[PDB]
Curated annotation (Swiss-Prot), chain A:
Outcome following mutation: L88I: Confers resistance to pyrophosphate analog PFA
Phenotype for Y184L: Confers resistance to efavirenz
Lineage start: Viruses, Riboviria, Pararnavirae, Artverviricota, Revtraviricetes
Regions that span the bilayer: none
Outcome (variant: P48R): Confers resistance to stavudine
Result after altering R207K: Confers resistance to lamivudine and zidovudine
Consequence the record notes for mutating M37L: Confers resistance to zidovudine
Effect noted on mutating G186Q: Confers resistance to efavirenz, HBY 097 and nevirapine
Outcome, altering Y111F: Confers resistance to abacavir
Result, substituting S64Y: Confers multi-NRTI resistance
Protein name (record): p51 RT
Stated consequence of mutating I131T: Confers resistance to delavirdine, efavirenz and nevirapine
Name of the gene: gag-pol
Annotated consequence of substituting G186S: Confers resistance to efavirenz and nevirapine
Substitution effect: E134K: Confers resistance to emivirine
């Protein structure tokens, strides 16, 4: 198989990302995996003349005992993006998010039998570190298309197509979107039919080598920010009430407050129950009305990063919003719970990433309510996805927390 | 010394760049003479070789005597070629911690003469290693030369050499798992738990392996004896430690004396539990010259004392035992200073350490303590490949209270309360609900961006009121000031309604010590209080307040 030639982006060159301290159990796992891949000719030891580096971790994946290797190409992917995206970019079916059932199938194996352009390999260097730095890490590079590299699916697209062609012809109402190492298969069938069709599809794959996740999009919807209902209202509640209302306009056009407001005025005691005028009962209502609606005015700009912010709300529950432009939400939902905070944040992040892949075909940049170090040390304990999105660490505004509670 | 029949590492200059071509400066005759002398010596050994002036490349050469001695050393100034050579793979990117070495029956040190000069250099590369010994003054063509081995002070020498060393050892390891070799610079630490006998055998069997490869080394009666000095440590058969520390006695201290002192102490605190340093540091801030003498504070002096106390008579650390567990215990030692110990059997430390930094402007103890835990957790994974069981001066409950209602996600691995004062606590809760029958202050604070003056004040709901003026402030400062007033004129319980997300944020955090003075007062208030409930609202959307 003569190889498709791969360029970097002009004026920049490969990644040199530091590797992360890894725990013994993971290092062992990686030494096995990497022995076996070397045998299979997938990767080859390299010499000090490769300065490049990409971090590498081991995960386990939902309901699997088997350690599995996970390379972090986030840096490489930005340094190639011209190739994988604008140059060999996979179109995105707005249809996918409508279907009643989306099964998600791991397809990383595909790649493993396409050679990597010879002059690109050096870019895929990784290291297996050793405890206490007692021995220099084992350094490798890939000979075949690596998983988690955004180039891999791009290159491997036309094979994918041939592979998928017949099944596609025979079931013209099943959407199949590929994003990286996964295939998203969406159908409108009774679930059993669906499952059958998935199995049926597995056979096709299984004839070129290939070899779960059951999602039901169409039944994703609002999360209308909720204004307490109730007879009686302390100043506090009304205070807390306007406050929350206050937040909502800015993203919600038409919101209304001042009516509710004049209920306030003068230094009354907080814990003081107070009469309620019933036109100000209308704002309440018609805000409530709107408050369940989409933001009128907000569209997804395919030329612009997505961002996803996450807030913590005790009781094992977290809120989150996706948008491209502060306050103009494309979407906003919630997650609910032996789980700790981090374990949870990690599950949440994957959940959202994956919704996000299905809706837009790209992954958001996360703003996480956690300490950089902590997230870093801990997240691989729970990570089960084959991709890794982008993240930062931030200090939830005190009030953002409630306006969403 | 031989020259390795081994493979070769293909080097390369940076893309779109060419070799070096720097002119050779005129040299004195004696210098010129030494070079001729040195080179023909080297050249006799194939280390280097004669070339033409057809080869268009040149790097300069120099030659100096040697401190006091009566010999001559050749200097090559690779700067330029170094600056045109491809980047390599960082050499050794961590260094073992004694605390992590698994103890061994017997270990000996092998080193290696002609480190770099025993290993070949990619051939197509040598061309660029061109240099020239010039002819007495201007006249004549100088003599031209280039490298066959790895030149000293060239960019790739350290990587390639360490790489080679690794390729070589590879086999001998395979056929000897029970044996451990630590490569360092050009030294070899080798150890096993086999009896004095086949050790030296095994060693010799190594010195041979190294010979079949052009690597020559000391033989018994030449290699050093325990304790090995290395990287600042003292490594004995049983324990390890930092190297002899001498904290001198003097009357005057300069900014220099104190810096050096702080450094020695920090280094010593790896294994000397208790070492303190913050008084000494204060002395350093907003600083004059290096030669400047700083009068030791009295507190500072107590430190200097309490430190010599600890350092008076030795402490050692034990090695690591992959089988048993890791326990880490932390103590609060004072103003944002924490100190810890790790060991596997009650009180034989594998190491000690300290944590101080101040993450944030306002923080509380519980926060600080979990930062330590993380910092200790990482250091641990690096060193032992696993996280230790912790013992902390905080009740499970205090900890459960804080994490529970903290905006940020958080998470300590396994731990157990241990009762060693000071204990860590929250110094005040804040109400969940408004307080029935207790004054409601509506406070506010403003500041003229120009005059920079501000009014700060409040108006409660038993119609009381105050106002104040502030000469050089900001909005932020004013709003802390209001909440401060309202907290002062209200005794035991009070509700406060600010529209300052800023102040609110800070106080919802339960700070308990703060860079800001004003915030610290608010804190002394907050502890005196008995029931405070604080609440926010938007302003200019002007409201009941
Ligand atoms: C720099 C350095 C120092 C030391 C070591 C390494 C690297 C890696 C190999 C292991 N290693 C050791 O020295 S640990 C072995 C140990 O517990 N200490 C020890 C045991 C026996 C002996 S003995 N019997 O005198 O040879 C000497 C020592 Cl210093």
């Amino acid at each position: 198989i003569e190889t498709v030639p791969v360029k970097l982006k002009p004026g920049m060159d490969g990644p040199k990302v530091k590797q992360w301290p890894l725990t013994e159990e993971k290092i062992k796992a990686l030494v096995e995996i990497c022995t076996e891949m070397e045998k299979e000719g997938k990767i080859s030891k390299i010499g000090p003349e490769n300065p490049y580096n990409t971090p590498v971790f081991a995960i386990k994946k939902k309901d699997s005992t088997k350690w599995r290797k996970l390379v972090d190409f986030r840096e490489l992917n930005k340094r190639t993006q011209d190739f994988w995206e604008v140059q060999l970019g996979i179109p995105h079916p707005a249809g996918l998010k409508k279907k009643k059932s989306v099964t998600v199938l791991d397809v990383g194996d595909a790649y493993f039998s396409v050679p990597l352009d010879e002059d690109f390999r050096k870019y895929t260097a990784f290291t297996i570190p050793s405890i206490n730095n007692e021995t220099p890490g084992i350094r490798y590079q890939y000979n075949v298309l690596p998983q988690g590299w955004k180039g891999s699916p791009a290159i491997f697209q036309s094979s994918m197509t041939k592979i998928l062609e017949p099944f596609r012809k025979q079931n013209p109402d099943i959407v199949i979107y590929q994003y990286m190492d996964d295939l998203y298969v969406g159908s409108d069938l009774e679930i059993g039919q669906h499952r059958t069709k998935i199995e049926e599809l597995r056979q096709h794959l299984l004839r070129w080598g290939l070899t779960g996740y059951e999602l039901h999009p169409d039944k994703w919807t609002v999360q209308p920010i909720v204004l307490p209902e109730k007879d009686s209202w302390t100043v506090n509640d009304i205070q807390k009430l306007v406050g929350k209302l206050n937040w909502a306009s800015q993203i919600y056009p038409g919101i209304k407050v001042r009516q509710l407001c004049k209920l306030l005025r003068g230094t009354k005691a907080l814990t003081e129950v107070i009469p309620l005028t019933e036109e100000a009962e209308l704002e309440l209502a018609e805000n409530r009305e709107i408050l369940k609606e989409p933001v009128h005015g907000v569209y997804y700009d395919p030329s612009k990063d997505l961002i996803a912010e996450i807030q913590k709300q005790g009781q094992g529950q977290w809120t989150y919003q996706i948008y491209q432009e502060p306050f103009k939400n494309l979407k906003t939902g919630k997650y609910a719970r032996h789980t700790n905070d981090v374990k949870q944040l990690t599950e949440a992040v994957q959940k959202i990433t994956t919704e996000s892949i299905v809706i837009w075909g790209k992954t958001p940049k996360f703003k996480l309510p956690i300490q950089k170090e902590t997230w870093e040390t801990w997240w691989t304990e729970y990570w089960q996805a084959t991709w890794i999105p982008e993240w930062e660490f931030v200090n939830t505004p005190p009030l953002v927390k409630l306006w969403y509670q | 010394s031989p020259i390795s029949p081994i493979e070769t590492v293909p080097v390369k200059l940076k893309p779109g760049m060419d070799g070096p071509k720097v002119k050779q400066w005129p040299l004195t005759e004696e210098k010129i003479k030494a070079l001729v002398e040195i080179c023909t010596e080297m050249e006799k050994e194939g280390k280097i070789s004669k070339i033409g002036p057809e080869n268009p490349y040149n790097t300069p050469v120099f030659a100096i005597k040697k401190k006091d001695s009566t010999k001559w050393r050749k200097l090559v100034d690779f700067r330029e070629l170094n600056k045109r050579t491809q980047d390599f793979w960082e050499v050794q990117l961590g260094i073992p911690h004694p605390a992590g070495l698994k103890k061994k029956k017997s270990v000996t040190v092998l080193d290696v003469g002609d480190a770099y000069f025993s290993v070949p250099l990619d051939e197509d590369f040598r061309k660029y290693t061109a240099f020239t010994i010039p002819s007495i003054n201007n006249e004549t063509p100088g003599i031209r030369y280039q490298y066959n081995v790895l030149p000293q002070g060239w960019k790739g020498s350290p990587a390639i050499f360490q790489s080679s060393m690794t390729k070589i050892l590879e086999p001998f390891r395979k056929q000897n798992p029970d044996i451990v070799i630590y490569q360092y610079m050009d030294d070899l630490y080798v150890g096993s738990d086999l009896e004095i006998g086949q050790h030296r055998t095994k060693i010799e069997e190594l010195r041979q392996h190294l010979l079949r490869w052009g690597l020559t080394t000391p033989d018994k009666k030449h290699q050093k004896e325990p304790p090995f000095l290395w990287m600042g440590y003292e490594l004995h058969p049983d324990k390890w430690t930092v190297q002899p520390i001498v904290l001198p006695e003097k009357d005057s201290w300069t900014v220099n004396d104190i810096q050096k002192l702080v450094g020695k102490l920090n280094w010593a605190s790896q294994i000397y539990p208790g070492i303190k340093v913050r008084q000494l540091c204060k002395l350093l801030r907003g600083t004059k010259a290096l030669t400047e003498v700083i009068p030791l504070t009295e507190e500072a002096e107590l430190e200097l004392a309490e430190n010599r106390e600890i350092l008076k008579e030795p402490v050692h650390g034990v090695y690591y035992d992959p089988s048993k567990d890791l326990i880490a215990e932390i103590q609060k030692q004072g103003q944002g200073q924490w100190t810890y110990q790790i060991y596997q059997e009650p009180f034989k430390n594998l190491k000690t350490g300290k944590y101080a930094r101040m993450r944030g402007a306002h923080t509380n103890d519980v926060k600080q303590l979990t930062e330590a835990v993380q910092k200790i957790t990482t250091e641990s994974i690096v060193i032992w490949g696993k996280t230790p069981k912790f013992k902390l001066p905080i009740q499970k409950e205090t900890w459960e209270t804080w994490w529970t209602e903290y905006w940020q996600a958080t998470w300590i691995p396994e731990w157990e309360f241990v009762n060693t004062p000071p204990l860590v606590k929250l110094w005040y809760q804040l109400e969940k609900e408004p307080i029935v029958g207790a004054e409601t202050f509506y406070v506010d604070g403003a500041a003229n961006r120009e005059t920079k003056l501000g009014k700060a004040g409040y108006v409660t709901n038993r119609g009381r009121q105050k106002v104040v003026t502030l000469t050089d402030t900001t909005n932020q400062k004013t709003e802390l000031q209001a909440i401060y007033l309202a907290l002062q004129d209200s005794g035991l319980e009070v509700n406060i309604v600010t529209d300052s997300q800023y102040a609110l944020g800070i106080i919802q955090a339960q700070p308990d010590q703060s860079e800001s003075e004003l915030v610290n007062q608010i804190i002394e208030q907050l502890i005196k209080k008995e029931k405070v409930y604080l609440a926010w609202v938007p302003a200019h959307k002007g409201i009941g307040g």
